[PDB]
Write an enzyme that holds these catalytic residues in place. Sequence first.
Site, short mmCIF file in Angstrom:
data_model
loop_
_atom_site.label_atom_id
_atom_site.label_comp_id
_atom_site.label_asym_id
_atom_site.label_seq_id
_atom_site.Cartn_x
_atom_site.Cartn_y
_atom_site.Cartn_z
N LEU A 40 -4.65 -0.35 5.71
CA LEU A 40 -4.07 1.72 6.66
C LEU A 40 -3.85 0.66 8.06
O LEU A 40 -3.78 2.09 8.43
CB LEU A 40 -5.92 2.11 7.04
CG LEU A 40 -6.13 2.45 5.32
CD1 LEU A 40 -7.92 2.80 5.60
CD2 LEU A 40 -5.82 3.34 4.96
N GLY A 43 -5.32 -3.48 14.42
CA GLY A 43 -5.16 -3.28 15.96
C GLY A 43 -5.07 -5.23 16.79
O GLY A 43 -4.20 -5.80 15.84
N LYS A 44 -5.01 -4.94 17.69
CA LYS A 44 -4.89 -6.20 18.44
C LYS A 44 -5.59 -7.33 18.12
O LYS A 44 -5.90 -8.48 17.83
CB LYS A 44 -5.46 -5.97 19.89
CG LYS A 44 -5.02 -7.18 21.18
CD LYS A 44 -3.67 -8.00 20.33
CE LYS A 44 -3.66 -9.35 21.23
NZ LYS A 44 -2.43 -8.33 22.85
N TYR A 45 -7.00 -7.03 17.34
CA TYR A 45 -8.50 -7.65 17.32
C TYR A 45 -8.56 -7.15 15.38
O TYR A 45 -9.53 -8.31 15.46
CB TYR A 45 -9.07 -7.91 17.91
CG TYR A 45 -8.73 -7.95 19.81
CD1 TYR A 45 -8.69 -8.81 19.99
CD2 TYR A 45 -8.35 -6.73 20.24
CE1 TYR A 45 -8.05 -9.32 21.44
CE2 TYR A 45 -8.77 -7.00 21.91
CZ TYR A 45 -8.08 -8.39 22.31
OH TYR A 45 -7.56 -8.46 23.59
N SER A 46 -7.52 -6.59 15.23
CA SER A 46 -8.67 -6.28 13.78
C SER A 46 -7.50 -5.71 12.55
O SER A 46 -6.53 -5.17 13.41
CB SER A 46 -9.54 -5.66 13.56
OG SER A 46 -9.09 -3.76 14.10
N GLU A 47 -7.63 -5.91 11.92
CA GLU A 47 -6.88 -5.48 10.40
C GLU A 47 -7.71 -4.36 9.90
O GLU A 47 -9.61 -5.09 9.69
CB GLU A 47 -6.66 -6.11 10.23
CG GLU A 47 -5.55 -5.81 8.84
CD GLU A 47 -4.03 -7.37 7.79
OE1 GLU A 47 -4.79 -8.24 8.04
OE2 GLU A 47 -3.14 -7.45 7.98
N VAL A 48 -7.07 -3.33 9.30
CA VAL A 48 -8.36 -2.80 8.58
C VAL A 48 -8.15 -1.63 7.36
O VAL A 48 -6.69 -1.54 6.92
CB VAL A 48 -7.79 -1.18 9.42
CG1 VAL A 48 -9.18 0.07 8.67
CG2 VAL A 48 -7.79 -1.32 10.93
N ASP A 151 -11.53 4.93 24.68
CA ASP A 151 -11.08 4.62 24.23
C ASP A 151 -10.99 5.57 23.37
O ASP A 151 -10.13 6.23 22.32
CB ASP A 151 -10.41 3.72 23.00
CG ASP A 151 -8.90 3.84 22.56
OD1 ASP A 151 -8.30 3.54 23.91
OD2 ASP A 151 -9.16 2.67 22.07
C1 LIG Z 1 -5.91 5.34 12.22
C2 LIG Z 1 -6.04 4.04 11.41
C3 LIG Z 1 -4.60 3.20 10.50
N1 LIG Z 1 -7.17 3.34 11.79
C4 LIG Z 1 -6.50 2.72 12.93
C5 LIG Z 1 -8.29 1.66 13.04
C6 LIG Z 1 -9.20 2.36 12.77
C7 LIG Z 1 -8.55 3.46 11.20
C8 LIG Z 1 -9.53 3.61 10.69
C9 LIG Z 1 -9.62 5.05 9.81
BR1 LIG Z 1 -8.12 5.70 8.80
C10 LIG Z 1 -10.71 4.92 8.84
BR2 LIG Z 1 -10.78 6.56 7.99
C11 LIG Z 1 -11.82 4.62 9.13
BR3 LIG Z 1 -13.40 5.42 8.27
C12 LIG Z 1 -11.52 3.94 9.82
BR4 LIG Z 1 -13.35 2.80 10.96
C13 LIG Z 1 -10.57 3.05 10.93
C14 LIG Z 1 -10.22 1.85 11.82
O1 LIG Z 1 -10.90 1.57 12.32
C15 LIG Z 1 -8.11 0.59 13.98
O2 LIG Z 1 -9.27 0.12 13.64
C16 LIG Z 1 -7.16 0.01 14.11
C17 LIG Z 1 -5.23 0.42 13.72
C18 LIG Z 1 -5.34 1.97 13.13
#
Ligand SMILES: CC(C)n1c2c(c3c1-c1c(Br)c(Br)c(Br)c(Br)c1C3=O)C(=O)CCC2
Length: 327
Positions: A40, A43-48, A151
């Site tokens: 999905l 981020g700087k410190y994670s991947e989702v 944030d």
């Molecule tokens: C905007 C989307 C792509 N997204 C991002 C993050 C996170 C998501 C996200 C979604 Br969507 C959903 Br649904 C749930 Br539930 C959760 Br939890 C998250 C989440 O943690 C990031 O941490 C940084 C990068 C972008």
Amino acid sequence: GSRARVYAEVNSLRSREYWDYEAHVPSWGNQDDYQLVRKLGRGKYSEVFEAINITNNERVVVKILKPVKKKKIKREVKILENLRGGTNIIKLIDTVKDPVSKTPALVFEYINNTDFKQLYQILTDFDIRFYMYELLKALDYCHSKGIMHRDVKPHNVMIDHQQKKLRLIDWGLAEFYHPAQEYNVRVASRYFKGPELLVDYQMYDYSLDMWSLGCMLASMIFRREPFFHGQDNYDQLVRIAKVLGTEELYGYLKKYHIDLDPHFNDILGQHSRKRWENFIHSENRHLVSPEALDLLDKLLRYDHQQRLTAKEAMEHPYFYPVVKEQS
Ligand SMILES: CC(C)n1c2c(c3c1-c1c(Br)c(Br)c(Br)c(Br)c1C3=O)C(=O)CCC2
Ligand SMILES: [Cl-]
Ligand SMILES: [Cl-]
């Protein structure tokens, strides 16, 4: 020095274990229960990832943490655990590790998020009131639990516009509020940074989140997203001052004895405070009411201590149609 008008002492009235996240010892379950389906984002410190729990077929979101930041991981975990069951806060289902590498990850409830850039151009007046009220519930809750999100922005407000579900996500910048504590101003995304951050004022509080939510409100009612579109952190304050006024900025700085970085002298210029009605035109007039402008005016204030609290905002007549429907 400055202090929050609400929930100022709330962490000090709780057990130290509540807020002493460095001492928190998470229970790490087994990531092998989860099958990753789709990436999905990152981020700087994670991947989702979207994922499925293979033991019960539940669909979830797994946030795999870059593991070299132990204190920050404990902070996010402890905050999420403290916020357990809060209204419209994303639910943390579990804290897990790859059992071999020990890389940690956070498992969240899934939300089927509608792309905000598309959504914000189709919201009705009632939709905006509804979603803003739902987001306020999450902020009032986390403020009442002694936590600043730090944030708030559209990308961190998941909205399933089909089911009308909202969740505030991404607690990795959140922190516990303690009176007189000086905080890092390198938080929030540029367009949602409160003036306090932009002028390097460290003694901020929950009211930072209220500025960010005001920015969101303004983008929704006026259909200018983001509402204050700075090119960098300096220009971000200039964009604010072109609306709220420069003399008014200086009165804020003077009240809190805030020192202004002298680079601002060459870029701020001289700007009158603008009437909020100046932002109305045929494309947004059906979203703007006197009650929306009165609420916005009370959120987008330089003086963080004079901004409405999340509760005061919920209490505003702009939300009366939502309260009545919810009744
Ligand atoms: C905007 C989307 C792509 N997204 C991002 C993050 C996170 C998501 C996200 C979604 Br969507 C959903 Br649904 C749930 Br539930 C959760 Br939890 C998250 C989440 O943690 C990031 O941490 C940084 C990068 C972008
Ligand atoms: Cl900090
Ligand atoms: Cl403007």
